Structure formats: C-alpha cells, structure tokens
C-alpha cells in the first residue's frame, strides 16, 4: 500500500474486468490513475465471443430517437475500458463523477507518458491469471473489427516511440556500465572501516 | 522405402504408433499374474 | 487529421481580405499587415521554418485558393476561399509546388 500523485499503468497484457475493478476501487479511494495502451488489453475467451457481445451491445438503441438517451457505442479501445470502469462506479452521483475525473485513458503511449514509469497490476495480468491453453483476444482487434479507424496510426506512433526507447536504452546501458566501473574504481579509495561498517549494516 | 499403400495417399506420413498415454505403468508378467488371480477369484 | 500550421502569401487581394470581415467598409483593413512583415524580417526565417515544419512533419498538403469574384457579374465583392488538396508526389514536392 502506497499513495502516489498519479499512477501510470501499461494496459498491455491486462484483463479488462479485473483491471477495471482495481482502477475503479483506486479512483473511489482517491488515487489518480492513467492507463496507456488500451489497445493491447486482453479479454478471456476466444475472439468471436467478444465480437458477439459487442454486436449484441450494438443492437441496443433508443427506438424513437437514436440521438438522445440511447447507448452511444464508442468503438475506441480506451473508451471500451472506460465503459468497463464506468460500470463499476456510481457515476450518477457527485462522488462518482469526481472519481471518474481522476482517470485518463489513452491508446498507445502519448507524451509525456512515454518518459514516465508504467506500472503493472499482477492481480489482472493475463499470464498470471489465465490457465495455459485457454483462449484470449485483444481489445484493439475487437475495436478495429467493430469500426475503430486508427489502428495503423497507433502502430506507426508506437514503432517510432519504441525506436526512440531503443536509443534511450542504449544510453542507459552505457551509463550503467560506467557506474559499475566507477564503483569498482572507487572501492579502493573508500575508507575500509566505512566499507565493513556498511557491509555489516547491509549496504 | 515404404512397401505398402496408405489409403488416403499421403505417402509422406510416418509409420504412426498407437496413442497409449498410460504406456509403461504395468509390466507384462505382472499383468499375466493378475489375470491368473482374477480368473481364480471370479 | 490535425492542422499543424499554415503559411500565407506576402500579398493578399482585397477581395480575399474581404472574407475576413463583416463590415469591411468600416474596417481599417489591417488583416495580414503584421504577417506581411514576416517576409521582410530576417529574410523570411519564420516562413522558412514553417515550410520546413510542413515538409518534415506533415502528410497531407492543401493549398488555400480563392476566386476572382470581380470578373463575375455578381454584385458580391467578397471572394470564396477553400482548401484544395495536392495529390501525388512526396510531401516535399507538395510544399515546393505550393
């Protein structure tokens, strides 16, 4: 348990309902949550089941006027996750609206979240929750098949972001190597009494 | 080379073995013995 | 699609400057007067960097084009301005073309 200013969560490899439940509980407790890469979220079960559920959702509409009151079907994966979270929050109250004001959802990783730490939720991770051999699908694939238009744009922006991250990781590896060499070289100039004192303390 | 004719014409298929996932648990001699006490008991 | 920037010409006609006004006859007609000084200051460095920004960041290039309404018999003096897409070539070719 720890309180943070804002928690950024990589949505890749997470199960939709479990991540939504944890995020809704954190928002109502008072923590600001940002979720990125909602296109890479997972849903358990084989893809045609999720597709059929989305088409059953698309069936529902106000008969007398489709411009008011009806289910407005948002096709973006971030908005699918937002609908999942909003179903678990008393959104028609002032407290629920304030709790929903503490959430931001995106597709891909826009700046400045590209240079921020992205945490994961092990209670919602697909590789830790699903039994091996069980089928799963991708919310981005579902969105593309139900009418989301920007799958290719997000993919291009993601590959540019990962190229820049590869350059950053190369510099990071160089810095880590130089730091290890600096520690090894400075181990001679450090006072030995300080050395076994820190070793006895555990540092 | 293969001397026989496979019925579906897939001549590259290997000589398959019986699907026996419980193979090797019980020896043959013990099974013969257990057949003998089974017959006597019946 | 999102408009990153636009670049205008140094001289705009009165009939296209009329489009930016509702009371052009009472106007001081100051439109684009400070913009026209950007062509003269620093040999158009701001115009050049906006052109380079369109060259290196953008994928769709459209010209802005207006009609010469004074050659028509219409009593309207305020011209019509629209965006026309440049199709074909690379983005640098589109920018140089415009």
């Amino acid at each position: 348990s720890s309180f943070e200013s804002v928690v950024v969560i990589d949505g890749k490899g997470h199960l939709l309902g479990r991540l939504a439940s944890i995020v809704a509980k954190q928002l109502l407790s008072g923590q600001k949550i940002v979720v990125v890469r909602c296109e890479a979220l997972n849903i358990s079960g084989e893809f045609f089941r999720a597709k059929l559920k989305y088409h059953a959702y698309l069936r529902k509409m106000t008969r007398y006027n489709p411009t008011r009151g009806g289910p407005f079907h948002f096709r973006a994966p971030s908005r699918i996750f937002y609908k999942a979270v909003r179903g678990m929050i008393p959104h028609k109250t002032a407290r629920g609206a304030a709790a929903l004001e503490r959430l931001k959802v995106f597709e891909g990783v826009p700046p400045p979240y590209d240079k921020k730490k992205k945490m994961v939720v092990p209670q919602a991770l697909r590789v830790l929750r699903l039994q091996p051999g069980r089928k799963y699908c991708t919310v981005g694939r579902l969105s593309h098949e139900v009418g989301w238009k920007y799958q290719d744009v997000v993919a291009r922006l993601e590959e540019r972001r990962k190229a820049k991250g590869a350059a950053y990781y190369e510099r990071k590896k160089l810095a880590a190597r130089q730091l290890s060499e600096a520690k090894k070289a400075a181990a001679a100039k450090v006072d030995p009494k300080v050395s076994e004192a820190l070793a006895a303390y555990g540092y | 080379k293969n001397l026989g004719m496979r019925k579906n014409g897939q001549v590259w298929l290997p000589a398959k073995k019986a699907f026996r996932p419980t193979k090797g648990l019980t020896s043959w001699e013990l099974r013969v013995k257990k057949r003998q006490e089974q017959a006597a008991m019946k | 699609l999102r408009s990153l920037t636009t670049v205008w010409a140094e001289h705009l006609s009165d009939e296209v400057k009329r489009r930016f006004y509702k009371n052009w006859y009472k106007s001081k007609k100051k439109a684009f007067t400070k913009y026209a000084k950007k062509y003269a200051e620093n040999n158009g460095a701001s115009i050049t960097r906006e052109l380079e920004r369109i060259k290196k960041y953008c994928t769709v290039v459209r010209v802005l084009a207006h009609t010469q309404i004074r050659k028509t018999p219409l009593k309207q003096k305020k011209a019509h301005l629209m965006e026309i897409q440049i199709n074909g070539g690379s983005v640098a070719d589109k920018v140089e073309f415009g």
């Binding site: - | 897939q10 001549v11 290997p14 699907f19 996932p21 | -």
Partner: protein, 190 residues
C-alpha cells in the same frame, strides 16, 4: 487424469539442420529453408540424442499429450520438404472445349501465375496466384498435366486446391459435364 510426463521423438537426417528458439522451428536442407512458428502449443524441445529431437509435455491433459503428435508430424513434414521436396501432379480433362493453361512467373512478386482459358467455352480468364515457393510447370511427358513442386507441403497442396476450386462447374449435371482440373498424383520431388 493429468499425465506427469509425455514424450515424442523426431529423428533428423545427417544433412539437415534444425534450429529451435522460442518454439520457432527453422529446418534447413539441400533444397532450402523452411520456418514455422509453434508458440501456440505448450511443448518443451530438447536434444535427447545426436540427431534426435525430443518433445515433452509435463502435467498435461490427454488433449495436450495428443497435440505432440501433430507437432511431430509437422516438423517431420518440414524435414521431408527440405530433404526430398513435395510434388503434386494434376490433370486437366475436357469433353469439347480444350482447356488452355498458361504458366508464367511474375517478376515483382516472384510467384507463379496460372491462367486458365476456354473452360467449357467460357470467355472469362481465370487467374490463380501460387504461394511463394511453389513452382509450376506444364508436363511434357504426359498429356494435359501440371506439375507443382516445392518445399512447403501446405503451400503446394493449397495451390493445387486453388487450381481445382477455380474450375468448378456450376448449374450443370456433374454426371454429364466432367471438365475440370484434378490432382492425380502426390509424392516427393526426389
């Protein structure tokens, strides 16, 4: 019942190279290289002996044990493909209108294209594009015969299936109208 340990065995010929990393099998031979991703099946690969590959499943069900047989046959098919290859001989027959079959190689794709004309007098030109790695020739030994050859059995057989399914007789009695292209022989190139 959950079986503690189950295992299958694949021998490898001496001139064949097998590389397995993250369940992505690459099999190289005299005729070339084939590659298949098998990461949808839970299996542990090992080298139990020189020239022998072992496949094992731990604590799997009967279905998971049975999947290893499919993996074994698939890898053996790639081995046979890179060693001896796969060859499908097809025959095209007709009653009145001769079937004109043109075989060409598209340069920018690298794939072969088979054009079929005059199928029961039709004016349309049917065009079938082969899978990459499938080579099609018109046989000179026998009459009205195509020969499809390659390393990938799935590619060769799917190309032959496409050639059959493009020349389908519609709205006619099939006991009377016998024109078409049919796979007549399946085997190895070597």
């Amino acid at each position: 019942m959950r079986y503690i340990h189950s295992e299958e065995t694949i021998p490898v010929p001496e001139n064949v190279k097998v590389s397995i990393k993250s369940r992505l099998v690459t099999v190289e031979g005299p005729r070339g290289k084939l590659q298949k991703d098998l990461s949808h099946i839970a299996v542990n690969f090992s080298v139990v002996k020189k020239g022998v590959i072992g496949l094992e499943i731990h604590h799997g069900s009967r279905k998971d044990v049975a999947a290893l047989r499919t993996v074994r046959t698939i890898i053996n098919n790639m081995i046979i493909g890179v060693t001896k290859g796969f060859k499908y001989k097809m025959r095209y027959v007709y009653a009145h209108f001769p079937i004109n079959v043109n075989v060409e190689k598209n340069a920018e794709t690298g794939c072969y294209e088979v054009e079929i004309r005059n199928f029961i007098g039709e004016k349309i030109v049917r065009k079938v594009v082969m899978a990459p790695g499938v080579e099609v020739e018109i046989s000179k030994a026998q009459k009205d015969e195509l020969i499809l050859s390659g390393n990938s059995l799935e590619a060769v057989s799917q190309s032959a299936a496409d050639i059959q399914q493009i020349c389908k007789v519609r709205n006619k009695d099939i006991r009377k109208f016998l024109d078409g292209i049919y796979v007549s022989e399946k085997g190895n190139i070597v």
